[PDB]
Design a protein around this ligand. Structure first.
Ligand SMILES: [Mg+2]
Ligand SMILES: [Mg+2]
Length: 337
């Protein structure tokens, strides 16, 4: 009953990300190794604003203003002439393109930071980004995924529709209510089936229709589900489906058949388990939460002699993805034992 080694997993994982996947003043690397042997992967030590946005969310949750500011300073330098944050940098070069989901994740961290630390600067900077999203990515109240200096795409991935950020934005300015309402309508009209109450992957603004994939991308649906509930919307049937599936298979994998709900992949991911844990945390489901956390504990590299100690990835090849590690850090942050 006296806690022993509380927050150990979080510490180990933060230590790995800070010492082994980061460079001071530069940011969080996308992969542990910049170039794989044989050259298949080549930009491992680029920095994604995805990674930075995740670390900012973690910092505000951790009430760590110093760490928050250190990653926000890197993001400010990734800002492009259109007001959006670049998707990626390599050394000193920013990519001229942006993804809506990264912009919205950063706006969310900034608005949370303003609420937490009473610092208007974060809020004003978030507004600049948000106004640029409206100017550059919006079409009939729908935000499209992709934006560069020449124009924008015409597809909307449902996991990009960050309802919680749009809700926060609506509290600052009413123009965001229409965006929230359209986004939520896209989500609500995109259920896969009654048997498998997960979500479509993409919405096509031109036809107002969804993809027709037979398989559900599970990670993406967990993102949509987490977004829905944090914004106060209803996900009772989807969460039941996840809880039943996790209970019956004993694991969750990358894809399921949209008709009958059978696993169609053998691949597990720390990002899937992270999201399931964040969902369970949010709704107060302790059993689901522990089940998801147990998977993350199991896959975390526990070997003190591995350079990957504390992290997630393949010990044999030193293959590591920042995205899985950062999502795991967010889940372990909720784990109090
Ligand atoms: Mg422990
Ligand atoms: Mg280390």
């Amino acid at each position: 009953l006296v806690p022993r080694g509380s927050h150990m997993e979080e510490k180990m994982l933060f230590d790995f990300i800070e010492k082994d996947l980061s460079k001071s003043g530069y940011g969080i690397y996308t992969n542990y190794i910049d170039k794989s042997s044989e050259g298949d992967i080549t930009k491992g030590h680029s920095v994604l604003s995805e990674s930075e946005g995740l670390m900012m969310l973690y910092s505000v949750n951790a009430n760590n203003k110093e760490l928050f500011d250190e990653h926000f300073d890197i993001v400010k330098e990734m800002r492009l002439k259109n007001g959006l944050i670049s998707w990626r940098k390599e050394g000193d070069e920013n990519s001229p393109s942006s993804a809506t989901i990264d912009e919205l994740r950063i706006i969310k961290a900034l608005l949370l930071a303003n609420n937490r630390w009473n610092s208007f600067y974060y809020k004003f900077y978030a507004i600049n980004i948000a106004n640029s999203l409206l100017k550059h990515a919006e079409e009939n109240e729908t935000l499209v995924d992709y934006i560069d200096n020449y124009g924008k795409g015409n597809t909307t991935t449902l996991c990009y529709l960050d309802l919680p950020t749009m809700k926060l934005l609506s509290q600052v300015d009413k123009k965001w209510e229409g965006i929230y309402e359209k986004s939520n309508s896209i989500i609500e009209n995109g259920k896969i089936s009654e048997e498998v109450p997960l979500y479509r992957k993409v919405f096509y603004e031109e036809t107002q229709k969804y993809d027709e994939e037979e398989n559900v991308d599970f990670l993406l649906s967990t993102i949509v589900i987490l977004n829905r509930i944090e914004a106060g919307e209803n996900e009772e049937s989807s969460i039941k489906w996840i809880k039943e599936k996790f209970k019956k298979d004993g694991f969750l994998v990358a894809t399921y058949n949209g008709k009958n709900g059978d696993a169609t992949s053998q691949i597990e991911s720390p990002s899937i388990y992270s999201n399931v844990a964040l969902i369970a945390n949010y709704i107060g489901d302790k059993e689901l939460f522990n089940k998801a956390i147990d998977k993350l504990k199991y896959y975390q590299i526990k070997n003190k002699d591995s350079v990957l100690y504390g992290g997630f990835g393949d010990e044999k090849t030193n293959s590591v993805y920042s995205f899985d590690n950062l999502n795991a850090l967010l889940a372990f942050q909720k784990y109090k034992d």
